[PDB]
């Protein structure tokens, strides 16, 4: 567990070679260079890797129960093998958002930090939003955020262009507003039909 405060030149953290059941690595980037490429690599342990709001973090856990934290910007997450938790603590934009490359059965998606108004669903909330043969990503977003999230934030999801997306609606109108509504990309078609919301924590089934 490495305290990293004030080490702001760091653009590559590579703990990938580390080895035990639980040789657990903790790291938090102190980088504040706007628009930086930062690479964070975990090891065999149950690692805890946090990026920077400033940065386009590529975060990769190894084996084991990794926690990858989103803070802002265009981030690329890969928890390798094991029950990884993708802890989403920022809203992002419509362009600067987190892509999770390898979301699979067992991995979790912790949305506690985007419950702007209240606290998410809590059900098994799992019928995909379906739109027309030529609906745009913009359209699918607007469709997903159609409801009222002013008093209570809601989760929805869809599949566009070969990738899977999750949304948090925290707004009035049927516009997905870049500011307070949130999108999360997941590489590939992953069916979240049967998957359930723990507290505000989605466990993939």
């Amino acid at each position: 567990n490495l305290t990293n405060t004030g080490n702001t030149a760091v653009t590559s953290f590579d703990a990938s070679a580390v080895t035990g059941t639980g040789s657990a690595v903790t790291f938090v980037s102190a980088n504040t260079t706007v628009g930086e490429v930062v690479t964070i690599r975990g090891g065999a342990g149950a690692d805890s890797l946090t990026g920077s709001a400033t940065a386009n973090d590529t975060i990769i856990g190894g084996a084991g129960a990794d926690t990858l934290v989103y803070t802002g910007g265009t981030d690329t997450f890969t928890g390798g093998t094991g029950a990884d938790i993708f802890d989403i603590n920022a809203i992002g934009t419509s362009t600067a958002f987190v892509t999770i490359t390898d979301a699979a059965v067992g991995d979790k998606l912790d949305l506690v930090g985007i419950s702007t108004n209240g606290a998410i669903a809590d059900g098994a909330f799992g019928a995909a939003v379906t739109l027309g043969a030529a609906a745009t990503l913009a359209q699918y977003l607007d469709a997903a955020a159609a409801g009222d999230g002013s008093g209570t934030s809601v989760a929805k999801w869809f599949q566009f262009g070969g990738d899977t997306y999750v949304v948090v609606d925290s707004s009035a109108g049927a516009t997905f507003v870049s500011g307070a509504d949130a999108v999360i990309k997941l590489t590939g078609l992953v069916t979240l039909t049967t998957s359930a919301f723990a507290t505000e924590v989605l466990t993939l089934a």
Partner: protein, 205 residues
């Protein structure tokens, strides 16, 4: 006897159970024992059963219930964790719990009032889900979230009614947001006082 059951006090232990009974005659009233449990920092669970209250009749054995007072070690602390997670009651007079680690309360039989306080921890609590499993419960008066009023109560209350009807005369939860009534047998709440509620959701059979 008809003469009343004298105190019961416990201090410490990994788990505590105090099981009173009353076996008085058919036209008498025995009033049962006041119970106090005070956990040490190993105390995960407490259970306090009594015989059900009844009105002294021609062929009805009369029982009044004893007050129960449950307290965790770290109840008065600003920083120390707290260990009492589950509390089970089976009938009760004026009951109290005080634990910052409390998540589950199991209720049962004939009650007067339950007051739930959480430890005087100054840190803002993150997990705020009261699970409240009921089964054959009837209340004279109020289940209150004493912590919600001037401090940080439970945001989401879950009530799971089970194998028998339950009736809560009053439920007072001033910080409550979601209320989900689930399970197996009727839950009746004669009167709630939960001004900040944004949704109520019955899933019960």
């Amino acid at each position: 006897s008809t003469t009343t059951t004298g105190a019961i006090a416990v201090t410490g232990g990994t788990a505590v159970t105090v099981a009173q009974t009353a076996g008085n005659a058919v036209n008498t009233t025995l009033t049962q024992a006041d119970v106090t449990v005070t956990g040490n920092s190993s105390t995960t669970a407490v259970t306090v059963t009594q015989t059900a209250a009844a009105t002294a009749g021609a062929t009805v054995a009369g029982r009044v219930n004893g007050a129960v007072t449950i307290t965790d070690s770290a109840a008065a602390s600003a920083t120390t964790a707290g260990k009492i997670a589950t509390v089970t009651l089976g009938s009760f007079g004026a009951a109290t719990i005080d634990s910052s680690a409390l998540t589950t309360v199991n209720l049962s039989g004939t009650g007067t009032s339950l007051g739930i306080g959480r430890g005087a921890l100054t840190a803002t609590p993150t997990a705020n889900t009261l699970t409240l499993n009921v089964n054959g419960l009837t209340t004279t008066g109020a289940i209150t979230d004493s912590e919600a009023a001037a401090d940080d109560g439970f945001t989401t209350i879950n009530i799971a009614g089970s194998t028998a009807s339950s009736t809560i005369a009053s439920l007072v939860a001033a910080d409550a947001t979601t209320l989900n009534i689930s399970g197996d047998a009727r839950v009746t709440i004669t009167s709630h006082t939960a001004a900040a509620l944004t949704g109520i959701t019955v899933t019960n059979s």
